[PDB]
């Protein structure tokens, strides 16, 4: 059922510069041509962002790395990714991440998006995967792991079906997706945005504001989370990582001066605690 | 007369007095709500065969309905009803957005714990409201539904826990509680406890031990598009007139005009620099309307002494006469850079100044004066 | 308008402080008159043109 | 010299700028809650009944009167400074020009 | 570090600083003012009103 | 035994831990009201008389 | 520091109407600048030493 | 929190009023000093130079 | 301490409380001393934050370099945000980031106590 993946190379973590990102519209109110001061949890500007990746390079001394660790959730998480092939699929949020407590699972399985809250028993190396069929050139879902069991399932949502493109595309990362995850008074709050990119290393420098996506009435304690990646198949050694990268930062209470343009879009911001200027 | 009241006098000295502002009264009212036709699921929420145990309380989303709670008057009786969010009399004039109903059974003595700021077994280990709570708490006696002769042991509550709950959490774990130094791997005795206990609800229990059904309605108001509205009939939309209005529960007075503002899909209201609503998205036609105050201003009165004459002239600072937000005319309309002066005779002779008006213009009371 | 703009309920409460509003305007009026006086004192030294 | 030195007339420009700021400040201050649940009277009135609304409104009225009183006090102080300047100018007109 | 040493002294200057009240130095020092004064006296004695 | 209301009983409490949670396992109170403190703050405090 | 020194909870409340702090500081700055200006006008009349 | 907020807001309003009073007094006093400084500057030019 | 909360720096005190006194008070009626509940000694309490900071800025339309003045810091672990380089002690505070030039000039941005600053030369 569950598979403990092997052959992975051990590498130190990478770090990057958050620059000026992680700003989201803090309200449901239209404002334009104004500056506005807000005190919510934000990613601090020019903060330490942990850079994780999935890669398969070559034989002999190949990197062979596939990062899917359990990370602290702390007070909220800034998550972003750069990819070209839909490798990052979803997340697990919870505390013990085992059968003793309720956990939240949000996954895009290339059919639909499924959100569940259950006393799930998770695999140590949860993953999804796609098998490449040389015959008729097809990329198709073949594996789903994530958990060995689920029980009471106190929350559930399933989206309408769609076809997700699973092609093992080559090139530069083309899609930047950003999310902000918060857990407030029982709600799991998600903000997000999709930005077209063309890059090969770390997060691009630039600025954008994320829009509210959903307020989920979950009711559970989250202290840790894990990122779910898909594998490419040609047991525990028979896999190719594909190429994707993801960044994780943490939110802190901060005061920001936000600038709205003439059409109500937030176009700039000042992190009031960054420096004396 | 306004000048006389301001000065607390029945006599006014020669000179110029300011007399408030030109104001406009509304003549029509506008009420706009999303055209929701379904009645809210009062039956499912209040007439359920079974309620959840308090340790594992239920939560349901309510949307796309009319909150006409008068339907409960014929058959329901509530021992408790308390609104934290709004005054009870305003419930039918409002719209609600993220509306959820929490539902469970507790003992009568524990009803007092379902409130912000309380402590006790329920408040600390089973169900907690935030100190900052918007919503209404409803409870009633269910002794004839939930109590059983030999004891209804179906309803459970948490007795043992290591830390307190945060608002709106549901801890449904059954792991053994360690009260002492023993690790409690299993054991289920001595200083190790099964954390949940039953309520022996019986028809012979005194009131504090009778079961109560509790429903908590949690909601946000006036900052997002409505999904649930009270039982209020809408009207037609009236533009370019001074009107009273109610848009999804948000009231005010002003003049509505078409807007060129483009709200994001999730925005319902817009605000100006002073954080006052200045735009709305109409709930039936998704048109953005701008709101301008009806009143504006600039009125002052030129008065000869009242012990001489009762004639006055009135200056309208922001009126360009050359019915223009003017109280009366009657000719004698003179346009100056200081405003439109009505009631004074304009002459072309220069004179020493007596009562100054502004921008080089001065008045006097002179000759049949 | 500053405090209870177009609000009947607010206005009726505001009446308790009506003597406060009167004093605010008296002070501003005194300034306004003075400003025209200052101009005349500096420029109109000679009334023969 | 006047054409080429923009700062030369700063003394007159400053008067204009200070007065504009004083009024812009009063408008911005309207957004303050002053202990009230909301800075918008319409929000208070829509959600609360009369006896509850009165409490929240009275908090706003007190704060708003305080803002206006602050404004008036500042204008009186500035008026005194200007009066002194005007008196000096009048003196110079008589003693330097006449 | 000096205000910790002075807790026993109950120095008003520290009390003011701890409550957010400070004092700013002048731009011209006493020495600079003395130089202006001396220049004016030297000028007057040497050349009068010229 | 409890005292008659006309002759109520006053007892001094000292040198102890006010771990009121021990009452959760047995007592049920219909009335509970604090006047000087908020109930949620009780576990962080020390009392004298 | 004067109103809410070293306290997170009252700081967040103070921000509610913190625009008043800015105005107070502007007034005091205006005085501070003026005091150095006064010194220069009285003493630095001759820029030759 | 909700009870503390009421008590805190009472203190904040009072504390802010004290600072505003201070500033007003400093502005008035500053004006008196300005007048003295202007006189001193006048004397420097007319009595010394 | 026995339910009384706060933030600060605790040091040994030379105050001697009467046997029935638990807490001390300042002129502002704030707490300034406590008896420790287990060790019978008296501690003084001093706020952590002392203050005095201002920033010297060339216009931002020219450059984003700034110098920071710490009014109550003597640089001769300094209670500064960064030691940086170019640490210049003046009588108006410890100034960090400005170069010290011994050539006098006309004052541009006044700092205080005879010191001014300007932006100039790779400026
Ligand atoms: C949310 O989960 C965390 C982690 O399990 C809980 O924190 C633990 O609480 C126990 C009991 O007091 C301590 O022994 C552990 O050391 C704590 N762990 C950590 C990482 O802090 C926390 O109490 C839970 N939240 C709620 C409301 O119950
Ligand atoms: C993975 O390894 C852990 C030990 O680190 C073991 O307990 C678990 O059963 C293994 N899972 C699988 C699927 O082999
Ligand atoms: C954090 O950022 C600093 C630069 O500000 C860098 O030197 C450091 O290596 C980064 N990572 C960690 C773990 O400190
Ligand atoms: C995705 O999840 C839905 C709902 O559980 C299921 O019906 C569907 O078959 C799943 N698709 C894949 C590829 O696992
Ligand atoms: C491609 O061929 C394999 C068998 O070799 C079959 O299992 C798979 O379904 C085929 N793919 C498609 C898209 O038909
Ligand atoms: C959770 O699942 C277990 C399965 O053994 C069951 O015994 C327990 O009653 C369930 N809890 C709730 C709240 O449904
Ligand atoms: C606002 O949108 C219009 C198109 O409707 C566009 O021309 C204009 O540049 C936009 N304004 C801003 C500040 O981006
Ligand atoms: C509950 O059912 C009874 C009939 O048994 C009906 O009269 C009553 O109105 C119902 N209550 C609700 C809320 O639907
Ligand atoms: C009903 O709602 C739709 C969608 O908002 C709107 O287009 C339509 O005009 C509304 N109609 C009524 C009350 O007839
Ligand atoms: C009134 O409007 C006309 C244009 O129609 C303009 O020429 C005139 O100056 C305005 N009057 C005043 C007092 O500004
Ligand atoms: C207990 O309290 C006394 C003071 O009454 C103290 O001297 C002793 O060290 C304390 N001891 C512990 C916890 O051992
Ligand atoms: C800083 O401390 C030194 C002694 O190390 C002293 O001589 C100097 O005067 C002090 N500086 C100031 C500005 O007080």
């Amino acid at each position: 059922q569950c598979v403990n993946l092997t052959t992975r190379t051990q590498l130190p973590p990478a770090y990057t510069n958050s620059f000026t990102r992680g700003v989201y519209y803090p309200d449901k109110v239209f404002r334009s041509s104004v500056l506005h001061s807000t005190q919510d949890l934000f990613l601090p500007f020019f903060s330490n962002v942990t850079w994780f990746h999935a890669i398969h390079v070559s034989g002999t001394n190949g990197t062979k790395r596939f990062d899917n660790p359990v990370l602290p959730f702390n007070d909220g998480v800034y998550f972003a990714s750069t990819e070209k092939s839909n490798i990052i699929r979803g997340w697990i949020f919870g505390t013990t991440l085992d059968s003793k407590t309720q956990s939240l699972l949000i996954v895009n399985n290339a059919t639909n998006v499924v959100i569940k809250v259950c006393e799930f028993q998770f695999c140590n190396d949860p993953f999804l995967g796609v098998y490449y069929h040389k015959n008729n050139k097809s990329w198709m879902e073949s594996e789903f792991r994530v958990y060995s069991s689920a029980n009471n399932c106190t929350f559930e949502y399933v989206s309408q079906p769609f076809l997700m493109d699973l092609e093992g595309k080559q090139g530069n990362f083309k899609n930047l997706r950003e999310f902000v995850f918060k857990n407030i008074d029982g709600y799991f709050k998600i903000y997000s945005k999709h930005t077209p990119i063309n890059l090969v290393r770390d997060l691009p420098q630039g600025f954008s504001a994320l829009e509210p996506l959903v307020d989920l009435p979950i009711g559970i304690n989250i202290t840790r989370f894990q990122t779910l990646l898909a594998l490419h198949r040609s047991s525990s050694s028979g896999w190719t990582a594909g190429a994707a990268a993801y960044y994780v930062g943490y939110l802190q209470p901060r005061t920001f001066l936000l600038k709205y343009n003439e059409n109500g879009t937030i176009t700039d911001a000042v992190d009031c605690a960054l420096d004396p200027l | 007369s306004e000048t006389k009241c301001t000065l607390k006098s029945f006599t006014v000295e020669k000179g110029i007095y300011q007399t408030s502002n030109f104001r406009v009264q509304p003549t029509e009212s506008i009420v706009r709500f999303p055209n929701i036709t379904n009645l809210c699921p009062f039956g499912e929420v209040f007439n359920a065969t079974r309620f959840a145990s308090v340790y594992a309380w239920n939560r349901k989303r309510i949307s796309n309905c009319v909150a006409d709670y008068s339907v409960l008057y014929n058959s329901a009786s509530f021992s408790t009803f308390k609104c934290y969010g709004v005054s009870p009399t305003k419930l039918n004039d409002l719209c609600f957005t993220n509306v959820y109903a929490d539902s469970f059974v507790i003992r009568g003595d524990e009803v007092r714990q379902i409130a912000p700021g309380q402590t006790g077994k329920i408040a600390d280990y089973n169900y907690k409201l935030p100190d900052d709570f918007t919503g209404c708490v409803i409870a009633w006696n269910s002794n004839n539904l939930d109590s059983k002769v030999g004891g209804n042991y179906n309803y459970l509550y948490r007795l043992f826990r290591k830390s307190n709950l945060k608002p709106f959490e549901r801890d449904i774990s059954t792991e053994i509680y360690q009260a002492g130094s023993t690790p409690c791997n299993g054991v289920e005795g001595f200083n190790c406890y099964f954390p949940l206990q039953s309520y022996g609800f019986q028809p012979t229990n005194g009131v504090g031990y009778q079961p109560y059904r509790v429903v908590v309605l949690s909601f946000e108001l006036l900052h997002a598009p409505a999904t649930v509205c009270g039982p209020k009939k809408s009207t037609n939309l009236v533009k370019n007139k001074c009107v009273n209005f109610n848009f999804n529960g948000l009231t005010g007075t002003g003049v509505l005009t078409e807007s060129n503002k483009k709200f994001l899909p999730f925005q319902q209201f817009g605000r100006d620099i002073a954080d006052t609503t200045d735009a709305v998205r109409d709930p039936q036609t998704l048109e953005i309307l701008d709101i301008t105050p009806c009143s504006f201003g600039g009125v002052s009165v030129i008065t000869p002494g009242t012990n001489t004459s009762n004639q006055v002239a009135v200056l309208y600072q922001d009126v360009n006469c050359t019915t223009w937000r003017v109280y009366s005319t009657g000719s004698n309309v003179f346009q100056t850079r200081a405003g439109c002066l009505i009631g004074a005779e304009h002459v072309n002779n220069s004179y020493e100044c007596d009562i100054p008006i502004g921008a080089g213009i001065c008045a006097s009371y002179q000759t049949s004066q | 308008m500053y405090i209870c703009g177009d609000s009947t309920e607010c206005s009726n409460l505001l009446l308790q402080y009506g003597s406060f509003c009167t004093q605010l305007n008296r002070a501003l009026t005194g300034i306004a008159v003075e400003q025209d006086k200052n101009t005349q004192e500096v420029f109109a030294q000679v009334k023969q043109i | 010299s006047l054409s080429s030195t923009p700062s030369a007339l700063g003394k007159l420009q400053d008067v204009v700028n200070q007065n504009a700021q004083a009024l812009n400040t009063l408008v911005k201050q309207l957004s303050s809650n002053f202990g009230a649940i909301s800075s918008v009277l319409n929000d208070i009135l829509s959600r609360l009944d009369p006896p509850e609304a009165e409490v929240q409104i009275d908090r706003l009225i007190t704060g708003r009167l305080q803002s206006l009183q602050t404004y008036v006090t500042q204008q009186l102080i500035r008026a005194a400074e200007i009066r002194a300047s005007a008196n000096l100018a009048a003196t110079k007109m008589s003693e330097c020009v006449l | 570090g000096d205000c910790l040493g002075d807790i026993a002294a109950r120095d008003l200057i520290c009390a003011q600083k701890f409550n957010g009240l400070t004092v700013l130095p002048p731009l011209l020092t006493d020495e600079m003012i003395a130089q202006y004064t001396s220049a004016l006296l030297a000028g007057t004695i040497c050349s009068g009103w010229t």
Side-chain angles (χ1 to χ4, degrees), chain A, chain B, chain C, chain D, chain E:
Chain A
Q1 185 183 34
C2 291
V3 178
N4 284 0
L5 295 176
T6 191
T7 78
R8 291 182 288 179
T9 301
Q10 304 303 309
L11 290 97
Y15 297 89
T16 191
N17 191 328
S18 70
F19 295 108
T20 57
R21 302 193 78 88
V23 173
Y24 61 90
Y25 287 85
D27 205 350
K28 302 290 182 64
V29 175
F30 180 83
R31 293 179 174 83
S32 65
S33 299
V34 297
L35 304 182
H36 182 70
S37 174
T38 182
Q39 296 75 34
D40 203 343
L41 303 174
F42 297 95
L43 185 67
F45 284 177
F46 300 99
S47 66
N48 277 83
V49 178
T50 301
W51 178 13
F52 301 94
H53 66 275
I55 192 166
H56 183 69
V57 179
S58 192
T60 69
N61 296 321
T63 299
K64 189 69 169 179
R65 183 72 186 182
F66 191 76
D67 288 311
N68 60 347
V70 178
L71 304 173
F73 188 77
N74 297 338
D75 295 326
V77 176
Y78 167 76
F79 183 92
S81 63
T82 58
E83 63 178 2
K84 62 185 179 289
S85 59
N86 295 317
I87 292 170
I88 298 166
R89 300 299 190 85
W91 305 267
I92 299 168
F93 301 92
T95 57
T96 60
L97 304 177
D98 66 9
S99 67
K100 293 185 282 290
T101 70
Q102 295 181 81
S103 297
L104 172 64
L105 178 65
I106 301 173
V107 178
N108 183 338
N109 74 1
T111 299
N112 57 28
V113 177
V114 179
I115 301 172
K116 292 183 185 292
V117 180
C118 312
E119 296 182 327
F120 286 108
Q121 177 63 61
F122 293 111
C123 299
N124 286 347
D125 288 323
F127 61 87
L128 286 87
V130 179
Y131 182 86
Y132 177 62
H133 297 270
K134 290 178 181 178
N135 295 326
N136 62 68
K137 298 183 181 179
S138 296
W139 297 88
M140 297 187 285
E141 296 289 297
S142 64
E143 295 187 317
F144 184 94
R145 297 288 182 268
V146 178
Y147 63 89
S148 61
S149 70
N151 289 283
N152 291 312
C153 298
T154 61
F155 180 86
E156 183 173 11
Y157 169 82
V158 180
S159 75
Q160 294 297 310
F162 55 84
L163 174 65
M164 183 165 71
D165 185 342
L166 302 177
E167 185 178 20
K169 296 182 197 291
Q170 304 299 305
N172 298 336
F173 291 150
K174 298 297 189 70
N175 296 98
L176 172 63
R177 296 187 179 92
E178 294 176 284
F179 301 89
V180 176
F181 300 111
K182 294 181 173 181
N183 185 343
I184 299 172
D185 297 341
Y187 291 91
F188 189 78
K189 293 177 174 282
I190 303 170
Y191 298 83
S192 70
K193 187 167 175 66
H194 181 203
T195 297
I197 60 171
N198 186 354
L199 57 88
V200 298
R201 294 290 183 273
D202 54 1
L203 290 170
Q205 183 172 9
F207 177 86
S208 67
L210 307 179
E211 295 181 2
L213 180 64
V214 62
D215 291 294
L216 298 172
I218 301 304
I220 68 173
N221 186 26
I222 299 170
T223 61
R224 299 192 296 163
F225 73 100
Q226 187 172 28
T227 301
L228 300 171
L229 304 178
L231 299 175
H232 296 276
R233 298 283 192 177
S234 297
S235 64
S236 64
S237 63
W239 63 276
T240 297
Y246 67 94
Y247 305 89
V248 179
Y250 296 96
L251 307 179
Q252 298 185 30
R254 292 289 187 277
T255 300
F256 282 76
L257 178 65
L258 303 177
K259 179 177 178 180
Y260 291 84
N261 70 10
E262 294 82 7
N263 295 354
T265 297
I266 297 167
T267 62
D268 206 343
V270 179
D271 179 342
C272 300
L274 179 60
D275 59 19
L277 180 57
Chain B
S1 295
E2 181 173 3
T3 298
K4 287 180 177 180
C5 290
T6 299
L7 299 174
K8 304 293 188 297
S9 178
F10 286 62
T11 299
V12 180
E13 296 294 323
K14 184 173 77 176
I16 300 177
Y17 300 90
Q18 299 294 303
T19 58
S20 187
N21 284 291
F22 187 82
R23 294 177 181 271
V24 176
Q25 300 300 312
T27 62
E28 298 187 7
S29 297
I30 299 170
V31 179
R32 305 287 287 173
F33 296 103
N35 38 324
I36 299 168
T37 62
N38 298 315
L39 179 68
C40 293
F42 285 101
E44 292 175 350
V45 173
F46 298 101
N47 254 31
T49 300
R50 294 289 183 271
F51 278 53
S53 293
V54 71
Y55 87 97
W57 50 270
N58 291 329
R59 186 171 180 87
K60 176 174 176 176
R61 180 178 288 157
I62 299 170
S63 67
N64 301 320
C65 67
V66 179
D68 186 345
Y69 61 84
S70 71
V71 301
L72 296 174
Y73 286 3
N74 186 56
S75 62
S77 180
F78 300 102
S79 297
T80 298
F81 181 56
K82 183 173 180 177
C83 294
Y84 294 92
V86 300
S87 296
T89 59
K90 296 293 194 178
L91 290 168
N92 288 335
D93 295 326
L94 299 170
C95 293
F96 309 89
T97 58
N98 289 326
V99 180
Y100 295 86
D102 292 338
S103 175
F104 54 88
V105 176
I106 60 171
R107 292 181 293 175
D109 286 346
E110 296 168 354
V111 172
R112 68 182 171 81
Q113 292 177 42
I114 309 303
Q118 301 300 307
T119 63
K121 289 191 284 291
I122 302 304
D124 297 310
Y125 303 154
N126 294 273
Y127 179 80
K128 186 170 179 67
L129 298 177
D131 288 347
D132 186 350
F133 176 70
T134 300
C136 302
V137 178
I138 300 164
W140 66 100
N141 188 288
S142 59
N143 187 59
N144 64 313
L145 302 177
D146 295 309
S147 296
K148 302 294 176 195
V149 171
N152 185 342
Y153 297 101
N154 291 338
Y155 292 103
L156 304 178
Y157 66 97
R158 185 178 296 277
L159 178 60
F160 295 92
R161 188 173 171 84
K162 293 180 180 178
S163 66
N164 296 328
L165 297 178
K166 295 181 180 182
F168 302 117
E169 291 179 334
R170 291 184 290 184
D171 187 351
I172 62 170
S173 173
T174 59
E175 294 295 316
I176 301 303
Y177 177 78
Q178 180 178 336
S181 65
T182 170
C184 296
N185 185 3
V187 177
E188 302 189 1
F190 178 60
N191 292 330
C192 301
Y193 299 89
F194 185 78
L196 306 176
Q197 300 295 314
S198 62
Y199 293 112
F201 292 117
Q202 292 181 280
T204 61
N205 288 352
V207 172
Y209 293 90
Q210 291 179 9
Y212 284 73
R213 287 178 171 206
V214 179
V215 176
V216 179
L217 304 178
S218 172
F219 53 82
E220 297 177 5
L221 298 169
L222 305 179
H223 291 77
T227 63
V228 178
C229 293
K232 189 180 295 293
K233 184 176 179 180
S234 67
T235 71
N236 291 319
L237 179 65
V238 179
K239 298 180 186 179
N240 299 318
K241 184 182 290 190
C242 183
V243 297
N244 296 312
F245 57 82
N246 181 326
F247 289 89
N248 299 331
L250 177 64
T251 63
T253 301
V255 179
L256 307 178
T257 70
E258 294 85 355
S259 181
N260 293 321
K261 292 177 180 180
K262 298 177 181 69
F263 285 13
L264 297 173
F266 56 86
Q267 296 176 317
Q268 180 61 52
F269 301 96
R271 301 280 174 82
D272 71 7
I273 197 66
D275 200 28
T276 299
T277 300
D278 66 6
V280 298
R281 185 170 71 190
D282 181 82
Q284 295 179 10
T285 298
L286 303 178
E287 184 179 31
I288 305 302
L289 305 176
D290 291 327
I291 304 169
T292 300
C294 293
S295 296
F296 188 66
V299 180
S300 64
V301 181
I302 300 163
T303 300
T306 61
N307 62 359
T308 300
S309 175
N310 292 320
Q311 294 178 43
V312 300
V314 180
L315 178 68
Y316 297 89
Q317 292 172 352
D318 292 304
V319 175
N320 191 351
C321 292
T322 298
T323 59
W324 306 270
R325 299 181 69 90
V326 172
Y327 290 115
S328 65
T329 57
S331 192
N332 297 312
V333 180
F334 177 34
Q335 185 72 57
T336 75
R337 291 181 178 183
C340 180
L341 175 62
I342 301 174
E345 180 179 354
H346 179 223
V347 301
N348 62 332
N349 295 326
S350 297
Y351 302 89
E352 296 84 2
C353 185
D354 187 2
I355 303 169
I357 296 170
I361 304 300
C362 187
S364 66
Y365 186 69
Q366 294 182 274
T367 305
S368 297
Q369 307 299 303
Chain C
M1 290 180 71
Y2 184 77
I3 300 168
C4 298
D6 301 348
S7 174
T8 299
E9 294 80 6
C10 183
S11 179
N12 287 340
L13 292 170
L14 184 58
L15 291 170
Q16 292 177 44
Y17 305 96
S19 67
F20 192 92
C21 288
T22 298
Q23 291 299 114
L24 292 171
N25 283 331
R26 290 178 69 199
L28 292 173
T29 299
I31 292 169
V33 172
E34 181 177 356
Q35 299 311 304
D36 286 305
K37 183 174 83 75
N38 287 341
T39 300
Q40 291 172 349
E41 288 179 354
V42 175
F43 290 98
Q45 297 304 323
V46 178
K47 300 300 197 294
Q48 305 300 311
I49 298 171
Chain D
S1 180
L2 290 170
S3 181
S4 294
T5 305
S7 66
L9 305 181
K11 288 180 175 178
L12 299 175
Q13 188 64 52
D14 286 339
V15 172
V16 173
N17 293 346
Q18 289 173 348
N19 287 329
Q21 291 170 346
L23 294 176
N24 288 333
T25 298
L26 286 172
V27 173
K28 289 178 182 178
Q29 289 173 339
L30 290 169
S31 69
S32 293
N33 289 339
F34 302 107
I37 64 174
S38 177
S39 64
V40 179
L41 290 171
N42 288 337
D43 181 45
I44 292 167
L45 291 169
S46 178
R47 292 189 293 108
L48 303 179
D49 63 22
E52 291 295 316
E54 288 179 348
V55 173
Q56 298 303 314
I57 293 168
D58 194 64
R59 290 179 186 179
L60 292 175
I61 291 169
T62 298
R64 296 272 176 79
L65 289 169
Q66 183 179 6
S67 294
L68 291 173
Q69 186 63 52
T70 298
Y71 171 79
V72 172
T73 300
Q74 293 295 307
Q75 293 298 103
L76 290 168
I77 293 168
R78 290 176 181 177
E81 182 176 357
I82 295 297
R83 182 175 59 251
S85 182
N87 287 342
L88 179 59
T91 298
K92 287 173 176 276
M93 192 68 78
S94 294
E95 295 179 12
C96 300
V97 175
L98 300 177
Chain E
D2 293 335
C3 289
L4 291 170
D6 288 339
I7 291 166
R10 297 280 83 204
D11 186 357
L12 291 172
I13 296 299
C14 290
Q16 290 170 7
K17 288 175 180 272
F18 281 116
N19 290 287
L21 307 175
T22 191
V23 177
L24 305 175
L27 181 59
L28 297 175
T29 64
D30 289 345
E31 293 79 6
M32 289 178 165
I33 298 301
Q35 290 180 38
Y36 281 122
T37 298
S38 293
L40 291 170
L41 293 173
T44 299
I45 293 166
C46 183
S47 62
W49 48 81
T50 62

